[PDB]
Design goal:
The protein is 46% helix and 6% strand. With 291 residues, the chain is mainly alpha-helical. It has 2 domains: 170 residues, Orthogonal Bundle (Peroxidase, domain 1); 121 residues, Peroxidase, domain 2. A 3-stranded antiparallel beta sheet has the order 4-5-6. The radius of gyration is 18 Å and the shape is globular. 43% of the residues are buried. It binds protoporphyrin IX containing FE and potassium ion. The site of potassium ion has 7 residues, from loops. Keywords: Heme, Hydrogen peroxide, Iron, Metal-binding, Mitochondrion, Organic radical, Oxidoreductase, Peroxidase, Phosphoprotein, Transit peptide.
Length: 291
């Protein structure tokens, strides 16, 4: 199918900045969540998992339909823990009922990245809710117990190349793994609610040991109290990925620019934007607005 972006009736930049602001203000207010990490990271993961179901071969899945609101996707084992992000957005959707679910899920990720001092991420509106029968089956999101070849092949389905894969993986700069959700435990960085290139710095500079966690799964651990999933660690095991990891670890600006492009692309895969559609929006942070 073809999914044409359709702007919420009569809405413009100012309307979406208000939604952005409400999300940002709630992010600031509910600071206790997850031992004070805040909802920033889970909102980014929600935006990615709701977009990552896309299949370039038949345009199924994707962020367009906002299908995560349906139980089949909502209960995907791969999405364990995202219910926290969805619950956070519920009051936002109630105040702005006119925004589509897909626009809200994706905007939530953009808002979180920017408020956490990450790069600006241009965002376009127009996603339209689709029926429950359009919900993609579980199993389209990646496994974490795999190697570089699996990662490379997996992301080709989302039309992402090596650079895009390494940049997107850098989102692990945020949050942590929760044993009860995924069978992995531990954070990737110390400042896990501040978006930066520390994921790459830690991967390259920490001393890693392949250990088994309490769920009997292998994960790389550092004495500093950080982890790297087998799929994260594969980024330094593969020579092509390694060069890019080193590049981002040594150029914060380059990582920001590349992540921004890759993240917008991820959130827009499968969507056809009319030639007369509005230009992408670049929202101001609460800080830039003095709010
Ligand atoms: C090979 C691909 C990837 C794998 C296997 C993977 C796996 C995981 C796992 C196992 C968790 C822990 C979930 C939990 O226990 O709560 C996680 C968390 C997270 N992932 Fe990834 N991920 C991948 C790619 C990405 C990408 C592309 C992004 C976004 C650009 C991303 C963003 C996040 C974020 C922000 C968290 C933290 C969530 C929180 O703290 O609540 N991941 N991922
Ligand atoms: K960080």
């Amino acid at each position: 199918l073809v999914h044409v972006a359709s702007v919420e009736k009569g809405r413009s930049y100012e309307d979406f900045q208000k939604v952005y602001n409400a999300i940002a203000l709630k992010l600031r207010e509910d600071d206790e969540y997850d031992n004070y990490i805040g909802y920033g990271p889970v909102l980014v993961r929600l935006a990615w998992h709701t977009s990552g179901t896309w299949d370039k071969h038949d345009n199924t899945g994707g962020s367009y339909g906002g299908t995560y609101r349906f139980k089949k996707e909502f209960n995907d084992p791969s999405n364990a823990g995202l219910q926290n992000g969805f619950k956070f957005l519920e009051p936002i959707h109630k105040e702005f009922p006119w925004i589509s679910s897909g626009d809200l899920f994706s905007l939530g990720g953009v808002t979180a990245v920017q408020e956490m001092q990450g790069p600006k991420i241009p965002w376009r509106c127009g996603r339209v809710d689709t029926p429950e029968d359009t919900t993609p089956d579980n199993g389209r999101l990646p496994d974490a117990d795999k190697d570089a070849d699996y990662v490379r092949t997996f992301f080709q389905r989302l039309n992402m190349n090596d650079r895009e894969v390494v940049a997107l993986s850098g989102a692990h700069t945020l949050g942590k793994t929760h044993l009860k959700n995924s069978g992995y435990e531990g954070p990737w960085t110390a400042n896990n609610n501040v978006f930066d290139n520390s994921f790459y710095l830690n991967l390259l500079n920490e001393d890693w040991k392949l250990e088994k966690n309490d769920a009997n799964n292998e994960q790389w651990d550092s004495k500093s109290g950080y982890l790297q999933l087998p799929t994260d660690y594969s980024l330094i095991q593969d020579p092509k990925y390694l060069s890019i990891v080193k590049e981002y670890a040594n150029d914060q600006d380059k990582f920001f620019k590349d992540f921004s492009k890759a993240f917008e692309k991820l959130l827009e895969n499968g969507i056809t934007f009319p030639k007369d559609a509005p230009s992408p929006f670049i929202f101001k942070t609460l800080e830039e607005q003095g709010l």
